[model samples]
Target: PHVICEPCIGVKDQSCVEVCPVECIYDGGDQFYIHPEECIDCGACVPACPVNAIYPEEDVPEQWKSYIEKNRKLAGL
Candidate 1:
């Protein structure tokens, strides 16, 4: 799954939204989150993010690593 990190918190954008073919992203009133279950690993939103907030599971920056679990929690996974 592609993860939405802290860079997106309170500063989200839609560049990722329109390019997301699966539309697997959701808003948590702070950032856009992508769930593992529905994600196709498309990486479609990586470059689209102006702040570079999106990344695949293996490549997520360590600083925002906690967002991975946060994604699952907020998504109710």
Candidate 2:
């Protein structure tokens, strides 16, 4: 799964959502949520986000690991 980081906290741009063929990205208050199990790893959402908030699961910054957990919670995992 890919993760949405801090840059998206209040920016919630839906550009990524529109490009994600799987529609795995969801509304999560101020930021968008990415369902871990549903993502196909297409990497389409990466460039779509104007804030550059999305990253591959392994590439997510250590300081933003909490966003990964946050995403799971929002996904109801």
Candidate 3:
């Protein structure tokens, strides 16, 4: 699963993109998106997000509910 959290929106720190093993993470309209098919699920980008913006799909906060599908679509899932 890919992440599209609020903290990344407008913040664009790119910490996640730097740590992703497969380089699946990418910049989005207001945030970052991860390519689901390309992600190795290595959890490398998680800790790299200083704002705690990265999370597993099932673990994502309710406030970020739309991000789930947003990333999926951005990845062309």
Candidate 4:
């Protein structure tokens, strides 16, 4: 799964959403969220983010690991 990390917290750039063919990204208060199970691992959103916020699940920074569960909880995964 692709993970939306700390850089996206307040910079909810919709470019990621636009590139996501699966339509898994959604508005989540301070940031946009990518549905944990719905993501196709296409990596389309990775470069679209101006803040460089998106990362592969396993590659997420150690400090941003909570985002994995946060995304899962939001998506009800």
TM-score of each: 0.93, 0.96, 0.88, 0.94
Compose the digit string of candidate 4's lDDT tens values, residues 13-62: 78998889989999888888889878999999998999999999989999
Local lDDT at 1 for model 1: 90
What value does the lDDT take at residue 9 in candidate 3?
77
- Model 1 scores a TM of 0.93
The reply for model 1, stretches above 4 Å from the true place, is none
- Give each prediction's root-mean-square deviation over alpha carbons: 0.9, 0.7, 1.2, 0.9
Relative to the true structure, candidate 3 reaches a TM of 0.88
lDDT of each: 0.87, 0.93, 0.81, 0.89
Error of 1 at 2 (Å): 0.5
lDDT per residue (tens digit) for residues 1-77 in model 1: 99999889878877898998888888877888897899999787899999988889899887888999999988997
Q: How far off is residue 70 in model 2, in Å?
A: 0.5
Candidate 4 off by > 4 Å: none
Q: Which candidate wins on lDDT?
A: 2
Clashing pairs in 4: none
Q: Give the per-residue Cα lDDT of candidate 3 at 31.
A: 79
Query: After best superposition, candidate 3 residue 47: deviation in angstroms?
Result: 0.9
Q: Is candidate 2 or candidate 4 better by TM-score?
A: 2
